């Protein structure tokens, strides 16, 4: 099955490593593909032949409760666009251990391990990573901070699209993350780019492998292509307010006589700080229980209304043409990571992704919930102290003040509200280019409205 070989191929790397350094072969040594192919054969023979212990991560309960599940409700996946293909993994958020995982819908027909093995865009879910979750770290950005949804066009010409929509107007981050507008998340990357933030920095800390940082669309997943398992440990690392653990199935291998193979090393890197990974939480709890992208919490609390009632975060994606959909849920105990496609690519139905997904994870996480009653946790996120709380303009996301708008100094007042920041200084004065990106007809048609308020 899907774990057996998982592991097998994992194994086979740490042993081909060990057996190199056991026989003293070079680096240089090591470049040669006769040595390389002698090795990997010799590190198969040792498994298959050494009588070695290889210590897993994986909880068996928990794991062959995800197993029933996929048997049990994975037809709840299928949408009239044929057998719909499925990986998911379930990773400790304090450890990065993987605890279980679905490899696809049975072994037996489709041995594509799509936990592991299969990369396809992570579409919107890569927002809360590389856009937003940077734009705060770097104190461009806080949670009441305001974005153009103005229609604008990609540097091609072609308009940037949401379904049928080219746009809106200004609207918070709250509002452009529990939507999943794109031309929100366009601005907060340009801002990044033109302020030449170290963007490749954060995502190689966490283990993603993007090859053009440049890509427009890099936000809503243009230009990535990830593993369920890799992308699970991206938001591991916000679930854990900010600190990274490398995912592992693997914890040790041992020989007979008890001698170390190899042995997982945590390194744990603070990838964001404790303000921006509890402040994108915050935005994320809102992303679920608004209900626009994904049923899933009504999905959940029909099934186990008390897990539901648990701190649940999460974002949604779909790619271009529906071809793949993702749901990252977290707990602060545990992520589970959801992909669906079909393996030759072709589109899902346009709701794959709202319901269908939504449904079937919301039976997985209850399955696992069943196997391992408190394994999901009862603690809630919480904003870190280091937070900065900031009253700022409902209008403007940022604080009172005077503006000059076509001449005249005007005095901007109304609605208030809380900002969580992660800088120092907090949310500034109000200034007339107040939203991230925009044109200057957006603005024009911002403040004529803002100004009509007054
Ligand atoms: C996040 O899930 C958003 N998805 C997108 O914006 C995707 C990004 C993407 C595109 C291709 C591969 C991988 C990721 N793009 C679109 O949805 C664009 C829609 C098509 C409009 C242009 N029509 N044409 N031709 C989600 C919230 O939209
Ligand atoms: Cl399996
Ligand atoms: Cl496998
Ligand atoms: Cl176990
Ligand atoms: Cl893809
Ligand atoms: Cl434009
Ligand atoms: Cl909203
Ligand atoms: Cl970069
Ligand atoms: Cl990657
Ligand atoms: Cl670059
Ligand atoms: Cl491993
Ligand atoms: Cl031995
Ligand atoms: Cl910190
Ligand atoms: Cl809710
Ligand atoms: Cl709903
Ligand atoms: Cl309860
Ligand atoms: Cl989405
Ligand atoms: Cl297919
Ligand atoms: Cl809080
Ligand atoms: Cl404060
Ligand atoms: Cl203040
Ligand atoms: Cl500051
Ligand atoms: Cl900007
Ligand atoms: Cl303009």
Redesign the pocket.
């Known amino acids: 099955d899907y774990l057996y070989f998982t592991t097998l191929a994992e194994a086979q790397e740490r042993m081909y490593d060990y057996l190199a350094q056991r026989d003293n072969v070079s680096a240089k040594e090591l470049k040669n593909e006769a040595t390389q192919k002698f090795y990997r054969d010799l590190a198969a023979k040792e498994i298959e032949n050494g009588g070695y212990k290889i210590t897993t991560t994986i909880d068996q309960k928990i794991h062959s409760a995800m197993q029933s599940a996929v048997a049990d409700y994975g037809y709840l996946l299928d949408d009239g666009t044929g057998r719909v293909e499925v990986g998911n993994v379930l990773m400790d958020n304090q450890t990065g251990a993987i605890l279980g995982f679905v490899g696809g819908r049975n072994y037996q027909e489709n041995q594509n391990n799509h936990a592991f093995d299969t990369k396809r865009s992570p579409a919107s879910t890569t927002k809360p990573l590389l856009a937003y979750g940077i734009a705060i770290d770097q104190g461009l950005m806080g949670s009441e901070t305001i974005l153009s949804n103005y229609?604008?066009?990609f540097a091609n010409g072609n308009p940037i699209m949401y379904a049928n929509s080219k746009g809106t107007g200004m609207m918070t981050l709250g509002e452009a993350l529990n939507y999943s507008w794109n031309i929100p998340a366009y601005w907060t990357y340009r801002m990044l780019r033109e302020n030449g933030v170290d963007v490749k920095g954060y995502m190689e800390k966490m283990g993603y492998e993007i090859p053009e940082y440049g890509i427009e669309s890099l936000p809503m997943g243009g230009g990535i292509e990830v593993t369920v398992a890799q992308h699970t440990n991206g938001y591991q690392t916000l679930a854990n307010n900010g600190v990274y653990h490398q995912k592992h199935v693997i914890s040790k291998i041992e020989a007979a006589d008890g001698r170390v193979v190899y042995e997982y090393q945590d390194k744990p890197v603070q990838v964001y700080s404790k303000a921006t990974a509890t402040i994108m939480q915050g935005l994320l709890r809102e992303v679920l229980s608004s209900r626009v992208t994904t049923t899933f919490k009504s999905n959940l609390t029909s099934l186990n209304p008390t897990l539901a009632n648990a701190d649940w975060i999460g974002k949604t994606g779909t790619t271009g043409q529906d071809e793949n959909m993702w749901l990252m849920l977290s707990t602060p105990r545990l992520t589970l990571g959801g992909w669906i496609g079909h393996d030759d690519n072709h589109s899902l139905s346009q709701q794959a992704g709202y319901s269908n997904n939504s449904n079937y994870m919301a039976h997985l996480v209850n399955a696992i919930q069943q196997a391992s009653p408190s394994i999901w946790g009862n603690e809630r996120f919480a904003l870190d102290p280091s937070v900065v709380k900031s009253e700022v303009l409902k209008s403007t996301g940022q604080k009172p003040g005077k503006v000059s708008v076509e001449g005249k100094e005007v005095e901007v007042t109304g609605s208030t509200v809380t900002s969580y920041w992660a800088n120092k200084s907090g949310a500034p004065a109000t200034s007339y280019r107040f939203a991230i990106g925009g044109?200057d007809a957006d603005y024009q048609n911002a403040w004529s409205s803002i100004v009509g308020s007054l």
Do not use: G, V, W
């Open positions: 229609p604008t066009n044109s």
